[PDB]
Amino acid sequence: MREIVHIQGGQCGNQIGAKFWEVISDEHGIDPTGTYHNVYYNEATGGRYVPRAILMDLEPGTMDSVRAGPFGQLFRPDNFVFGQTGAGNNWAKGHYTEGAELIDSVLDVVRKEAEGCDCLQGFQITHSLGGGTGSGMGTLLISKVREEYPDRIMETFSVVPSPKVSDTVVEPYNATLSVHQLVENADECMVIDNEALYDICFRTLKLTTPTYGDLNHLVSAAMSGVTCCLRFPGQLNSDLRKLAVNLIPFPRLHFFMIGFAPLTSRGSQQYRALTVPELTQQMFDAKNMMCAADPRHGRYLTASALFRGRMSTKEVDEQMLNVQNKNSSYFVEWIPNNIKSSICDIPPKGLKMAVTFVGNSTAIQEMFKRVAEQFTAMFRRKAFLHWYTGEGMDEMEFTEAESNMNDLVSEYQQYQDATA
Amino acid sequence: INMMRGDLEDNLNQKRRNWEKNTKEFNIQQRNEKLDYERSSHLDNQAQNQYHITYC
Numbered sequence: 001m002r003e004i005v006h007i008q009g010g011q012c013g014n015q016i017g018a019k020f021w022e023v024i025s026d027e028h029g030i031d032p033t034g035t036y037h038n039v040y041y042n043e044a045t046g047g048r049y050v051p052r053a054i055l056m057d058l059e060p061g062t063m064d065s066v067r068a069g070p071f072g073q074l075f076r077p078d079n080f081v082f083g084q085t086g087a088g089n090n091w092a093k094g095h096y097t098e099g100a101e102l103i104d105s106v107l108d109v110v111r112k113e114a115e116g117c118d119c120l121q122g123f124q125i126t127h128s129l130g131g132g133t134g135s136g137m138g139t140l141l142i143s144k145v146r147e148e149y150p151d152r153i154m155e156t157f158s159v160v161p162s163p164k165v166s167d168t169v170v171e172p173y174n175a176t177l178s179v180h181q182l183v184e185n186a187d188e189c190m191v192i193d194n195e196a197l198y199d200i201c202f203r204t205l206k207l208t209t210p211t212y213g214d215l216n217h218l219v220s221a222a223m224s225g226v227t228c229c230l231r232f233p234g235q236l237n238s239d240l241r242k243l244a245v246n247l248i249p250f251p252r253l254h255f256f257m258i259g260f261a262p263l264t265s266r267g268s269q270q271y272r273a274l275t276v277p278e279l280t281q282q283m284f285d286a287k288n289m290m291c292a293a294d295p296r297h298g299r300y301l302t303a304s305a306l307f308r309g310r311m312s313t314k315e316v317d318e319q320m321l322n323v324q325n326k327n328s329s330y331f332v333e334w335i336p337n338n339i340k341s342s343i344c345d346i347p348p349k350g351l352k353m354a355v356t357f358v359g360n361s362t363a364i365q366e367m368f369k370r371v372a373e374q375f376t377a378m379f380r381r382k383a384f385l386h387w388y389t390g391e392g393m394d395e396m397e398f399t400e401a402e403s404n405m406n407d408l409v410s411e412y413q414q415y416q417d418a419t420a
Numbered sequence: 421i422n423m424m425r426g427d428l429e430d431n432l433n434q435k436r437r438n439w440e441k442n443t444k445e446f447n448i449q450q451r452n453e454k455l456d457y458e459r460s461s462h463l464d465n466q467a468q469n470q471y472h473i474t475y476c
């Protein structure tokens with residue numbers, strides 16, 4: 001019933017997905033053995049539970065991770081489709097040359113896992129954008145499956161690299177290459193970066209050494225809180241499509257920002273309240289989101305707010321109306337009531353409230369801009385091109401890919417200029 | 421004679437309602453025996469699955 005599949009590729013994708021399965025298991029009350037202590041799990045003999053997920057990569061080193069970290073005995077042994085060469089940070093190695101050889105087996109596993117469903121509500125994938133395995137194989141899989149299941153919809157939590165944090169020196173290439181077709185046949189691209197998470201765990205949680213563990217934990221908890229309102233009874237329920245109408249005004253303006261609330265450290269947790277006013281004051285700022293794009297330098301075409309726990313619908317509703325008609329400038333005026341709310345009846349494990357703030361804004365367009373910046377300074381000189389064209393991939397494509405990007409960002413700016 | 425006919429028809433209707441409630445007793449017993457059936461069959465299924473899987 002309204003079941004969801006799980007594809008996780010690339011190093012970061014696999015890490016975050018393992019953490020997400022951990023958080024879900026600790027939410028539905030599932031210990032690492034697969035017992036209780038159909039939206040995500042499937043039944044198995046002796047009351048065991050199998051997470052509905054497929055793990056793919058071109059180097060099986062990640063196997064170590066998904067077998068060492070907690071909740072590693074949950075996944076299916078047939079759902080580990082691994083390569084041997086490794087894409088090695090290059091997109092071509094994972095979309096034309098080698099990934100094009102195991103993508104068919106991944107498609108076969110996807111078919112064997114989706115036919116076991118009875119009402120498939122959508123897809124959700126997690127992957128990087130420069131990681132050859134991740135970006136390449138995930139984009140190829142998205143292409144194939146959307147060319148296979150036109151009715152269903154995909155909601156990908158791709159993790160773009162922001163240049164404020166330097167990881168590798170070939171990101172812009174793979175980033176633009178994947179964006180060229182991620183705006184094509186994907187309906188919810190919730191982008192995430194690393195600078196936002198570092199700023200969060202420094203100036204919002206006072207953590208000492210922000211480590212990948214807690215970063216992934218935070219983004220996974222947000223990923224869960226996104227769709228939780230379908231996993232339980234609610235007063236104003238939602239799904240992965242009630243977002244696909246409230247948050248996609250145009251078939252390409254679908255790039256989403258994600259924010260989680262509440263977020264505090266121990267002392268702060270002690271000395272503060274947990275109510276609609278405080279959560280609202282906590283979520284509409286800039287540095288409670290997971291995108292290094294200052295939203296107050298743009299607007300929000302639409303903004304959904306999935307609350308969790310139990311409250312008075314009048315209170316959250318009046319708070320939304322008030323925060324809108326006070327931030328009238330930072331919101332878009334040619335659309336009426338651009339905000340949406342949705343309330344479930346079960347809070348997460350640990351607290352008494354929760355807030356997932358999803359936003360189809362017009363600020364993250366600037367993000368593409370800065371990435372495009374590097375692209376030009378890595379293409380005008382044709383630098384680091386002798387690793388791409390040497391794998392069958394024709395160079396010409398790259399050019400038009402960049403052109404496509406323009407259209408995208410253009411649209412955003414154009415809609416920032418519309419009036420009535 | 422009018423009083424007698426009234427009394428006789430009253431008794432007949434009472435007998436009707438009595439048999440109806442008897443049939444409802446039977447129907448509830450039927451439903452609960454079916455639930456017994458399904459739970460016992462589920463436990464038997466788990467038993468046979470353990471027996472087949474632990475068959476090394």
Ligand SMILES: Nc1nc2c(ncn2[C@@H]2O[C@H](COP(=O)(O)OP(=O)(O)O)[C@@H](O)[C@H]2O)c(=O)[nH]1
Pocket residue numbers: 009010011012013015087088089128129130131132133134135161167168194212215216
């Ligand atoms: N939040 C988070 N991001 C990561 C992590 N590991 C890698 N990333 C990002 O993932 C980027 C590239 O994707 P990756 O899957 O590692 O490359 P590939 O596996 O070799 O194809 C890297 O440049 C990292 O910035 C992690 O543990 N946590």
